[PDB]
Design a binder for this molecule. Sequence first.
Ligand SMILES: NC(=O)c1ccc[n+]([C@@H]2O[C@H](COP(=O)([O-])OP(=O)(O)OC[C@H]3O[C@@H](n4cnc5c(N)ncnc54)[C@H](OP(=O)(O)O)[C@@H]3O)[C@@H](O)[C@H]2O)c1
Ligand SMILES: NC(=O)c1ccc[n+]([C@@H]2O[C@H](COP(=O)([O-])OP(=O)(O)OC[C@H]3O[C@@H](n4cnc5c(N)ncnc54)[C@H](OP(=O)(O)O)[C@@H]3O)[C@@H](O)[C@H]2O)c1
Ligand SMILES: NC(=O)c1ccc[n+]([C@@H]2O[C@H](COP(=O)([O-])OP(=O)(O)OC[C@H]3O[C@@H](n4cnc5c(N)ncnc54)[C@H](OP(=O)(O)O)[C@@H]3O)[C@@H](O)[C@H]2O)c1
Ligand SMILES: NC(=O)c1ccc[n+]([C@@H]2O[C@H](COP(=O)([O-])OP(=O)(O)OC[C@H]3O[C@@H](n4cnc5c(N)ncnc54)[C@H](OP(=O)(O)O)[C@@H]3O)[C@@H](O)[C@H]2O)c1
Ligand SMILES: Nc1ccc2nc(N)nc(N)c2c1
Ligand SMILES: Nc1ccc2nc(N)nc(N)c2c1
Ligand SMILES: Nc1ccc2nc(N)nc(N)c2c1
Ligand SMILES: Nc1ccc2nc(N)nc(N)c2c1
Ligand SMILES: Nc1ccc2nc(N)nc(N)c2c1
Lengths: 256, 264, 276, 274
Amino acid sequence: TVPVALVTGAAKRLGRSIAEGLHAEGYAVCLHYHRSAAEANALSATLNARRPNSAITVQADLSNVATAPAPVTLFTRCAELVAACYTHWGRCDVLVNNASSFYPTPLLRREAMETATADLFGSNAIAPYFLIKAFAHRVAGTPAKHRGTNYSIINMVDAMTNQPLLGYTIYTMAKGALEGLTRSAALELAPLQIRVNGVGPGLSVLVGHRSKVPLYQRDSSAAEVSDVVIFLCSSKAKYITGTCVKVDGGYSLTRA
Amino acid sequence: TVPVALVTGAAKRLGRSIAEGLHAEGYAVCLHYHRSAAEANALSATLNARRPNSAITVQADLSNVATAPVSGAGSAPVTLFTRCAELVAACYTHWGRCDVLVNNASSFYPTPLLRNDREAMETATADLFGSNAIAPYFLIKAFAHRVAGTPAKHRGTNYSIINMVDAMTNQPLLGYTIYTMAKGALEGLTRSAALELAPLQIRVNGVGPGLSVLVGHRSKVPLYQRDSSAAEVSDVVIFLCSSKAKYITGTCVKVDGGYSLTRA
Amino acid sequence: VPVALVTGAAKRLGRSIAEGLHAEGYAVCLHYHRSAAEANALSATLNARRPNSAITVQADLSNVATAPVSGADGSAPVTLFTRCAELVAACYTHWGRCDVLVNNASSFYPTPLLRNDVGDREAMETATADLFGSNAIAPYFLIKAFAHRVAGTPAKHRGTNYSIINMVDAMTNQPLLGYTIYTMAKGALEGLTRSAALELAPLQIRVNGVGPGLSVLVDDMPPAVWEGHRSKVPLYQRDSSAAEVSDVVIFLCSSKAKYITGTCVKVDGGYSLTRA
Amino acid sequence: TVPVALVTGAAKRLGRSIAEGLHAEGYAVCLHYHRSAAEANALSATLNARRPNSAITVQADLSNVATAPVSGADGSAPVTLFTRCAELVAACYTHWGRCDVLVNNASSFYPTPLLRGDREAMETATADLFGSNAIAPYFLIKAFAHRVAGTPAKHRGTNYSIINMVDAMTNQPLLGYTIYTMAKGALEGLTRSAALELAPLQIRVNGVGPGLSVLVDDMPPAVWEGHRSKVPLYQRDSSAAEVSDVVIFLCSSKAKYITGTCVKVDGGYSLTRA
Ligand SMILES: NC(=O)c1ccc[n+]([C@@H]2O[C@H](COP(=O)([O-])OP(=O)(O)OC[C@H]3O[C@@H](n4cnc5c(N)ncnc54)[C@H](OP(=O)(O)O)[C@@H]3O)[C@@H](O)[C@H]2O)c1
Ligand SMILES: NC(=O)c1ccc[n+]([C@@H]2O[C@H](COP(=O)([O-])OP(=O)(O)OC[C@H]3O[C@@H](n4cnc5c(N)ncnc54)[C@H](OP(=O)(O)O)[C@@H]3O)[C@@H](O)[C@H]2O)c1
Ligand SMILES: NC(=O)c1ccc[n+]([C@@H]2O[C@H](COP(=O)([O-])OP(=O)(O)OC[C@H]3O[C@@H](n4cnc5c(N)ncnc54)[C@H](OP(=O)(O)O)[C@@H]3O)[C@@H](O)[C@H]2O)c1
Ligand SMILES: NC(=O)c1ccc[n+]([C@@H]2O[C@H](COP(=O)([O-])OP(=O)(O)OC[C@H]3O[C@@H](n4cnc5c(N)ncnc54)[C@H](OP(=O)(O)O)[C@@H]3O)[C@@H](O)[C@H]2O)c1
Ligand SMILES: Nc1ccc2nc(N)nc(N)c2c1
Ligand SMILES: Nc1ccc2nc(N)nc(N)c2c1
Ligand SMILES: Nc1ccc2nc(N)nc(N)c2c1
Ligand SMILES: Nc1ccc2nc(N)nc(N)c2c1
Ligand SMILES: Nc1ccc2nc(N)nc(N)c2c1
């Protein structure tokens, strides 16, 4: 049997690491991307080279916008992401909401503020919700007899959002939304044995505040975060749900 | 002169109580509403009867959608940001100031992840996230620009924003995911706005009811075994707005009779 | 006519709380350990403004047995629980009631996990007892005694606004380096706030916390380093005044707050929102 | 080559599972106990049978009281909690020359209501509940840290880890268990404080908080079923392993960027309301 994982924003950095980690545990991986076509396909080739038919790639804008062929809504695109797993492998056991846009929306000093709202809220919060819904329908729609035994959803949150980065309000709001989703989804999907957890990095794979991380005085490596994600997805973590785990080297414990 | 408060969803229940509470402390009140025209105007008449020119009513859909221009009809021109800016502007146009903002307006209804039609998900998403999170952000932006745009010598001395949050969102109501998500966003806004607006001395706080003015659920509340009254919530909002609370910012105050301390 | 007991009431925030409560019409039992002069001076002020509106009681709130006397000798020794029961009693003996309790008294000093990487079993066995006593254990026994006197009053002769306030700390999730026992104690105090709110709800006794960030900071340091510490608070770039904290305590004690219980209110100018 | 773990309250249930779990990853285990001598020595024999010299069992009251020093009617006398704690950690260094992991698992748990010669049960409840759950962990952590600091950087281990067994439900307190709840609150504080202070020594300090685990069935079957079914996930309390596997993961080098955090292992129980 092969378990299947869908990882959004899978092409580089943390998403890559999560994809690789899950693959190393024997998962077939659906690598989602938006712009990073080259890196996603390059990664898929690597995984497929180690293990045939263990990686595909699909493309999607997770921004809260309808596109063009009815233009196509964000819900439709999200449903089609999950479907891509079922079409290709007949299952989807793990979902990782990792894709996330991150840039300033200052309150102090209007078209590019239309699209900021749709992008930052789409990637970080709205799309995750629709992805979860699609994920949950597919599971519910499978007869109990042929359901998987380790359904897990991980939401990439942020360990530092209680201590907001100055000027990043929409982003912080979006992560707040995502934490809400983690709790709400965990509660509603418990009957289907679908676990919903969060993982929140502090500082990871940077390119300043490096020296202010108490443990090691450095940002983390990609693996230092993905290993937590992978652990939470393992059956060892089968009683954990609705919780967020900080992977931040004690950064959230600091003050100015 | 007279301090001015903008209160969204002001027509009934908690928003009305907040409006009344603020008015009782001497504030002029801009009462926002969406469809409760009758109850908003009725309230404005009451306040204006008690004190001339101390209340106006303004109408706005705070959903994350477009509305029509002049003599037209909807999904066209007027954005949520524009409508929000015009709400804050209405205070400055009428009274020349806006000292307090209360983000109270909020849609609340089920969005189940488990079925157990096509626009349903679109308009729920825009409404629940608009009222509860997006509009509050734009309202705060508009609020902040106006304060920033006033020359220092001419600014008020007690700028306060209150966000109606939810004391129970860490223990989510089954099937209310988008709503819970939206309140989560609102909490983030509270913290983020408090930090960014601190230099302008604008305070940003949350108030979170548990159960208030219910139309045994009550019997579950540890203290008194009842939902709260409107005043039991608005008095907290009003206190946080007072100058005695001038060192409080970026915090959420539960007003829940100890409901959040319970478990199944 | 309503009565308040305020521990550590002689100076600073405790003084402000006492004054604030007194200004709302409360009779105030001012508790002190070390500050006799400053407590009696305050009591005289309050009594001058309003006759019989202030008394002073002395007690070490450290988790130690302290024997029959402050001079003579022995019989059986006096536990912390006894001392705490006698504090609450002092209110009932003098005024026949105790409507509000404010656990404000608190010791605060370093207990480093590491040395450099003198000390004894004394400074150690007494730091634990003092920091945990003042901040957590005594509050628990105070609350017990408070709750027993309320429960023991026939429903007809009970007050209508019973309130307990626990002075917590807004910054304990971002611990001050080297202050572990103190932080642990505040952690314990937070727990007490939740647990007591739940258990005392049926008697309509509300239990809430107030947590300062930086308040009435002491300048036993260079002016620039004082300016240094002040300016990291986002709101106003200063520590708070005593009133800025006490007004919150007083509001939570008012009937206007009678649906709030089991919550902690930071009063910190957004300091808890910062990071290194 | 062999990493060493100290586990307090190791004799059964969760502590045993943690001990077994750590032993399965190759740790030598110092099993602590207070009252459960038989169970602790039985477990030690098991571990030692699977791998020689991979388990010892030390005895200690972690209550906040001073004990008497093996006696001899002479020699000052009062052994403080701090001393007993230092001697626990020392026992690892004496026997194996190291101590890489500490698990503060030992915990007394019983009612201290605020309503309704036993001054005796107020003093001793306070010392026991606060000792086991908070004070002793503090001294244990101190001893642990002093001993790492005292090692020349050259010989230090590379995966120092402290786990504190907390409680996922303490924000929603169990009626009548105030001291216990306060004690867990203290423990949470310790986790944060110790993480911050011990970061320079690369000692990680984390919490693991169960909701319901291996629920004692001393009630009507249906009362047990009732409580049981309050957990959203699976409608049951956890198994010991379902908790210890989390402890063991946090101790692994794959978790070496995690510090100062508490991980709920509660099947979503903390998400419920009355
Ligand atoms: N890096 C950190 O220190 C840090 C700190 C806290 C939290 N996190 C969280 O951890 C996760 C991963 O971190 P990261 O730094 O690796 O992320 P990242 O480098 O900033 O980007 C993640 C991916 O998100 C995708 N994405 C962004 N907007 C999208 C949109 N509108 N539609 C579809 N895809 C979109 C991008 O895909 P394409 O390139 O294919 O377009 C991008 O590769 C994120 O959720 C982040 O919020 C990271
Ligand atoms: N009631 C409770 O027990 C409870 C519990 C937790 C939190 N809260 C929070 O406390 C606040 C007030 O509670 P409540 O029960 O008084 O609220 P409510 O009765 O449900 O309604 C508040 C107002 O929000 C306005 N509104 C809703 N959607 C809108 C939209 N899309 N655009 C513009 N206005 C919109 C409505 O105005 P119109 O009628 O004029 O259209 C409504 O009167 C809310 O933020 C709520 O989330 C309440
Ligand atoms: N000041 C701040 O910025 C700050 C920050 C966070 C939290 N807080 C909290 O707010 C409360 C008041 O703050 P503060 O700065 O005004 O307090 P403070 O000046 O440090 O002292 C409070 C009082 O506690 C009493 N006290 C200390 N140990 C005692 C003991 N073992 N037994 C009996 N009484 C004892 C002392 O009374 P005597 O002088 O009579 O001996 C002292 O005057 C405290 O709970 C504190 O933890 C304050
Ligand atoms: N079980 C749960 O559902 C649950 C829920 C939440 C949190 N937890 C936490 O998880 C941990 C383990 O749970 P558990 O149920 O396995 O614990 P447990 O059965 O209640 O006992 C743990 C051990 O602690 C030791 N202990 C108690 N008081 C002591 C003292 N004063 N001095 C020295 N040792 C003492 C006992 O050792 P001896 O028998 O050798 O005397 C006991 O075996 C505890 O920290 C607990 O607080 C458990
Ligand atoms: N430091 C940093 C770099 C990139 C990031 N990307 C996303 N999506 N979110 C972050 N918080 C982030 C942080
Ligand atoms: N019980 C109840 C009734 C009405 C409500 N309205 C809003 N907007 N939000 C609520 N949480 C709510 C709750
Ligand atoms: N029981 C007893 C007998 C004699 C004592 N003498 C002093 N000085 N102090 C005591 N506590 C004492 C007690
Ligand atoms: N800065 C400061 C000064 C005095 C204090 N006293 C107590 N008791 N607690 C504090 N946190 C404190 C802080
Ligand atoms: N249910 C249960 C059983 C035993 C326990 N032991 C300790 N020490 N702590 C608990 N919370 C506990 C809970």
